[PDB]
Amino acid sequence: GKKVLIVYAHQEPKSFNGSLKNVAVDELSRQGCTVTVSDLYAMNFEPRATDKDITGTLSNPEVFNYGVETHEAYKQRSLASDITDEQKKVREADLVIFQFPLYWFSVPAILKGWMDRVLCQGFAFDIPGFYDSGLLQGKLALLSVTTGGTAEMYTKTGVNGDSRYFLWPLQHGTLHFCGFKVLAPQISFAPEIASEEERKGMVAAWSQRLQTIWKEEPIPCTAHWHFG
C-alpha cells in the first residue's frame, strides 16, 4: 500500500496539466494507491515567505530572519496551519509528484512558494541533515513538467540548452537536498504546438509510465547526470 501526493500548479482544470494530473489520479487510484492532490491555485495558496507564517513569539523580533524564525516555529508548533497542513501530506506520502507548466525555466511562483514555505528547516532538512541525510529520506519525488519549447529547443545545441540544465535547482538543490530519491522527470514537450494525436500520445505515455512507477529506480541526482 502506497500514498501519493500530487502538488499541482495550473489555473485551468481543462488544461493539458489538468489532464496529466487527472490521469495520474485515475491510474494511481486504479492501482489501489492512496492519492491526495494539493491544487495550489484552487487553494489560493500563499506563496510569500512572511512573518505571518509564524504565530508565536519571535526569537529575534528586532531583526526578522525568515529561516531562523520558521525553524524555531516548526520546533515549537507555531507555524501557520496552511504550512503544517501541507507538511502532513508530505510526511505521510511515499511519492510526491509535482505537476506544473515550466515558467522561466522553473516552477510557477505559486509552487515556488510551496517549496519556500513548506520545506522548512527541522521538517525537510537540518544542518547537518541534508542531501543523502535529508529528513525526507525514503521518499520518492518526480517532476512532471510541460513546456512551450519543443524537445529540439531543449537539446545541448538548441537555444535553450538541454532540458536537464533547468532541472538542477529543483531536483538537486531542492528535492535531493531534502533527502528525496528523485525519479526521472516526465517532460511533456510543447503541447500547444503538438497535434491532437501527439497530445493524446503524451497523456497516454504518462498514464502508461505510472502503471510501473513503483518498479522504477531513482536517477543518480548528480552534476554529471544534469550536465555531463
Ligand X SMILES: COc1cc2nc(N3CCN(C(=O)c4ccco4)CC3)nc(N)c2cc1OC
Ligand Y SMILES: Cc1cc2nc3c(=O)[nH]c(=O)nc-3n(C[C@H](O)[C@H](O)[C@H](O)COP(=O)(O)OP(=O)(O)OC[C@H]3O[C@@H](n4cnc5c(N)ncnc54)[C@H](O)[C@@H]3O)c2cc1C
Return binding residues: 10, 16-19, 102-105, 125-127, 146-149, 154, 172, 176, 192, 199, 221
Please classify residue 57 by burial: count the beta carbons closer than 10 Å to its beta carbon, then call 0-12 exposed, 13-18 middle and 19+ buried: exposed
Shortest CB 28 distance to a copy of itself, Å: 25
**Secondary structure of residue 193 in the 3-state scheme:** coil
**Contact with a copy of itself (CB under 8 A): which of 97, 113, 136, 183?**
113
Which residue carries 513546456 as its cell? 147
| Residue 110 touches which of a copy of itself, ligand Y, Zn ion, none (Cβ within 5-8 Å per kind) | a copy of itself
Cell of 100: 506544473
Taking a C-beta distance cutoff of 8 angstroms, is the pair 183, 140 a contact?
yes
Task: Give yes or no for residue 98 binding ligand X (CB under 6 A).
Answer: no
CB-based contacts of 11, cutoff 8 Å, min separation 6: 41
Please classify residue 84 by burial: count the beta carbons closer than 10 Å to its beta carbon, then call 0-12 exposed, 13-18 middle and 19+ buried: middle
Which residue carries 519549447 as its cell? 149
Q: What pairing do the DSSP bridges indicate for beta strands 186-188 and 181-182?
A: unpaired
Task: Give yes or no for residue 194 binding a copy of itself (CB under 8 A).
Answer: no
Task: Give yes or no for residue 59 binding ligand X (CB under 6 A).
Answer: no
Contacts to ligand X from residues 192-211, by CB under 6 A: 192-193
DSSP summary character for residue 174: I
| Residue 30 touches which of a copy of itself, Zn ion, ligand Y, none (Cβ within 5-8 Å per kind) | none
**Contact with ligand X (CB under 6 A): which of 68, 80, 109, 184?**
68
Contacts to ligand X from residues 150-189, by CB under 6 A: 153, 159-160, 173, 177
Site for Zn ion, rule CB under 5 A:
172, 176, 221
Residues in the site for ligand X, rule: CB under 6 A? 67-68, 104-105, 127, 148-149, 153, 159-160, 173, 177, 192-193
